[PDB]
From Swiss-Prot:
It comes from Homo sapiens. The chain holds residues 114 to 331 of 331 of the full protein. The gene is CTSS. The lineage of its organism: Eukaryota, Metazoa, Chordata, Craniata, Vertebrata. Disulfide bonds join C13-C111, C23-C67, C57-C100, C159-C207. Keywords: Cytoplasmic vesicle, Disulfide bond, Glycoprotein, Hydrolase, Lysosome, Protease, Secreted, Signal, Thiol protease, Zymogen. Belongs to the peptidase C1 family. It is found in: Lysosome; Secreted; Cytoplasmic vesicle, Phagosome. Its EC number is 3.4.22.27. It is an enzyme of class 3 (hydrolase). This is Cathepsin S. GO terms for molecular function: collagen binding; cysteine-type endopeptidase activity; cysteine-type peptidase activity; fibronectin binding; laminin binding; proteoglycan binding; serine-type endopeptidase activity. The keyword Oxidoreductase does not apply. Thiol protease. Key protease responsible for the removal of the invariant chain from MHC class II molecules and MHC class II antigen presentation. The bond-specificity of this proteinase is in part similar to the specificities of cathepsin L. Monomer. GO terms for cellular component: collagen-containing extracellular matrix; endolysosome lumen; extracellular region; extracellular space; ficolin-1-rich granule lumen; intracellular membrane-bounded organelle; late endosome; lysosomal lumen.
């Protein structure tokens, strides 16, 4: 029996909202956000991890294009292959494509594996968010209603299931019966509800939220 509502922020597993600026690095912020929660679950410490590390180092071999887009799954594979990712403090975000500056001396997390969830299955996504932690997802954010969102449960009839923006599902619930996914964005804390958007849940894979979910794990 899953909880009716989940909010990983209340459990100390979510870092402060980040601001990607003019660099299309949402995939990198989605990936580090998911791994940040697993690091807290494993070690008890909450540490912001380096999105810039992914932008600069998880590149053409991983199909990623830095400030021009990428995949959360191949970001996880880079962290696995590299045997680490630096802290955000040591490798801070510059919103630019740079040469790789990874230094194992400042490693703050590792990744053992990642799991992809089946396309469009919001029931499986709910289970993963409840039982595993925050889940990286793509959404279709190419709608003014999306970036103009201020509060409430977001529903856009013109939304598609084809994703183009990486975000992090940190919980779920309902607002007076309107079910939602609790989504951490990387557009700063003045977007939406202090940086978050509550997106329609169980409305036919609204905006592609459950099209391509994935989450990392840190295993002993
Ligand atoms: C080593 N390696 C891989 O493992 N892949 C993977 C990448 C993930 N796909 C899974 C496809 C699932 N899928 N995901 C998205 C998707 C999910 C999240 C996000 Cl936010 C985005 C947005 N990202 C982009 O639109 C993007 C832009 C520029 C460069 C890369 C991605 C897309 C869209 C369609 C689709 O079938 C399998 C091959 C590789 C792909 C390439 Cl092109 C080159 C090397 C790769």
């Amino acid at each position: 029996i899953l909880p009716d509502s989940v909010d990983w922020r209340e459990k100390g597993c979510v870092t402060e909202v980040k601001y990607q600026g003019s660099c299309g690095a949402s995939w990198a912020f989605s990936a580090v956000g998911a791994l940040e929660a697993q690091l807290k679950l494993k070690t008890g410490k909450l540490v912001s991890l380096s999105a810039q590390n992914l932008v600069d180092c998880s590149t053409e071999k991983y199909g990623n294009k830095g400030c021009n887009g990428g995949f959360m799954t191949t970001a996880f594979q880079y962290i696995i292959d590299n045997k680490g990712i630096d802290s955000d403090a040591s490798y801070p975000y510059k919103a630019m494509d740079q040469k790789c500056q990874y230094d194992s001396k400042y490693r703050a997390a590792t990744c053992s594996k990642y799991t992809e969830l089946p396309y469009g299955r919001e029931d499986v996504l709910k289970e993963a968010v409840a039982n595993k932690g925050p889940v990286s997802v793509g959404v279709d954010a190419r709608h003014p209603s999306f970036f103009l969102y201020r509060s409430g449960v977001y529903y856009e009839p013109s939304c598609t299931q084809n994703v183009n923006h990486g975000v992090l599902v940190v919980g779920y619930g309902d607002l007076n019966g309107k079910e939602y996914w609790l989504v951490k964005n990387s557009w700063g804390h003045n977007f939406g509800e202090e940086g978050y958007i509550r997106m329609a849940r169980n409305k036919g894979n609204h905006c592609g939220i459950a099209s391509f979910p994935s989450y990392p794990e840190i295993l002993q």
